[PDB]
Amino acid sequence: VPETRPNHTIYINNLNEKIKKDELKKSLHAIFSRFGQILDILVSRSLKMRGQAWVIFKEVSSATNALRSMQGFPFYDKPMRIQYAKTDSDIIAKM
Amino acid sequence: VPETRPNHTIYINNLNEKIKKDELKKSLHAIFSRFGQILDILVSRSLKMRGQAWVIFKEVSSATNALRSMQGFPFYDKPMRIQYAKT
Amino acid sequence: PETRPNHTIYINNLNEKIKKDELKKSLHAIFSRFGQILDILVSRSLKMRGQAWVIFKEVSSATNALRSMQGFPFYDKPMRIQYAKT
């Protein structure tokens, strides 16, 4: 059940697909910044990748609090669906 | 993203529209009183207020614990959708 | 009542594709971080499908598991969690 095992990265699904990547990244930064230091936020607007984002935290504890605190939060009328990434970002190996 | 910025008041939607007002308020009180001092609960089944409820806590910290703990709780067979109220 | 803390969480909206043995091993792997699990009840009878009970040694463990895993998207389905009721 790797998606339930804490690591530095949360995977968010069920995001409103009408939000532009630029606006999405700024909004996710304002939502998630209260849980710890964000290294970066990933959004692909490649057709298959819409409604999805990755928030990478400096510490695992920050990602866990963010995941438990924001699970199901109705953002632009849609509940956020949050997991941990199955694999954690290469940036963590470089920390 | 002001719906995600902590406030004294939580805004709940996706409430079961078949529950009547006196029973919905009493149930909302019984669920939310463990998180802090509740100043008041606004429910109306009138117009664009239906399926919704405002719980006003004495302290913001109580609202934050209430919203995070009860987000998606299946209340009368519907998952609670909880935001902070707008200022 | 479903909101009043007790030793046991009742989970539904579980994907019915999952078989008894894998579902119990998966639920133990998911919920073991919240406290000591005493057992997990699963039945693959029709009326018991998509459902499970996780019994913790302490009520505080059950409360943490329910608040922490509420709505968790497991096999494409957000977990629905309540405390066990009569």
Side-chain angles (χ1 to χ4, degrees):
Chain A
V1 291
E3 61 272 6
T4 78
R5 295 190 62 80
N7 67 23
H8 294 81
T9 303
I10 62 169
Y11 166 56
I12 306 162
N13 198 8
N14 204 40
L15 290 175
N16 206 301
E17 285 153 32
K18 293 197 294 279
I19 317 167
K20 298 291 171 227
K21 153 170 181 152
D22 215 284
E23 183 62 7
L24 185 48
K25 293 177 78 138
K26 280 182 214 290
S27 284
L28 289 179
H29 202 281
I31 298 169
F32 280 111
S33 177
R34 64 183 70 252
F35 302 105
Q37 198 165 322
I38 295 164
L39 295 181
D40 202 8
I41 305 185
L42 273 69
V43 182
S44 186
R45 261 208 291 157
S46 286
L47 190 77
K48 170 158 204 181
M49 296 304 191
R50 226 155 298 176
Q52 292 170 89
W54 290 261
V55 185
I56 306 169
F57 288 90
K58 193 162 196 306
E59 301 304 335
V60 179
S61 65
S62 304
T64 293
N65 192 17
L67 180 153
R68 299 178 178 177
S69 303
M70 292 307 303
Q71 188 71 265
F73 190 110
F75 180 52
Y76 279 110
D77 296 270
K78 286 166 78 65
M80 291 189 184
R81 307 306 193 187
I82 314 183
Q83 297 179 330
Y84 305 103
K86 283 187 207 318
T87 67
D88 192 359
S89 171
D90 192 65
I91 185 165
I92 300 315
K94 271 54 167 184
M95 265 182 60
Chain B
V1 291
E3 63 273 3
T4 75
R5 296 188 53 75
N7 176 278
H8 286 91
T9 305
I10 65 176
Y11 169 53
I12 311 162
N13 65 14
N14 201 42
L15 291 175
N16 192 337
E17 294 171 359
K18 293 161 131 65
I19 305 297
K20 181 59 177 169
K21 153 170 186 165
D22 298 336
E23 192 202 333
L24 185 53
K25 293 181 63 150
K26 159 192 183 74
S27 290
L28 284 172
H29 204 276
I31 292 168
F32 284 108
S33 74
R34 70 183 59 248
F35 299 110
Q37 181 45 51
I38 297 180
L39 297 191
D40 208 350
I41 303 179
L42 309 174
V43 169
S44 191
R45 288 187 63 243
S46 59
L47 312 176
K48 308 159 274 183
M49 301 277 264
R50 200 193 297 283
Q52 291 152 93
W54 290 261
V55 184
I56 306 170
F57 292 90
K58 198 181 189 302
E59 298 307 345
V60 173
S61 68
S62 302
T64 290
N65 199 19
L67 176 151
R68 294 174 181 185
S69 305
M70 301 304 311
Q71 191 69 261
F73 190 93
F75 189 51
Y76 301 102
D77 304 351
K78 292 177 60 64
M80 276 186 182
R81 303 295 170 214
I82 318 182
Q83 307 178 311
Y84 299 109
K86 297 179 177 180
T87 40
Chain C
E2 312 95 5
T3 76
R4 300 194 51 79
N6 72 57
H7 285 83
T8 297
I9 61 163
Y10 170 54
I11 311 151
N12 64 349
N13 205 28
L14 296 167
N15 197 314
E16 308 195 3
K17 284 202 276 273
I18 310 162
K19 273 147 196 129
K20 194 209 209 219
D21 276 46
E22 182 188 316
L23 181 57
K24 285 183 59 176
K25 285 156 197 255
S26 294
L27 292 169
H28 204 287
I30 293 168
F31 282 107
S32 166
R33 68 179 66 256
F34 300 109
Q36 196 169 304
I37 297 168
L38 298 182
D39 275 342
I40 296 178
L41 170 65
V42 166
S43 175
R44 291 292 279 145
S45 290
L46 213 81
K47 274 183 330 189
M48 296 281 280
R49 291 213 163 185
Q51 297 169 80
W53 289 258
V54 176
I55 310 182
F56 290 93
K57 197 169 149 239
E58 312 296 343
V59 178
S60 67
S61 307
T63 288
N64 188 23
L66 180 149
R67 297 185 175 178
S68 296
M69 291 305 303
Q70 192 70 260
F72 190 102
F74 181 54
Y75 275 92
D76 313 280
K77 290 173 83 71
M79 281 189 162
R80 308 308 188 184
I81 318 186
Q82 306 157 68
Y83 300 106
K85 69 157 172 309
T86 299

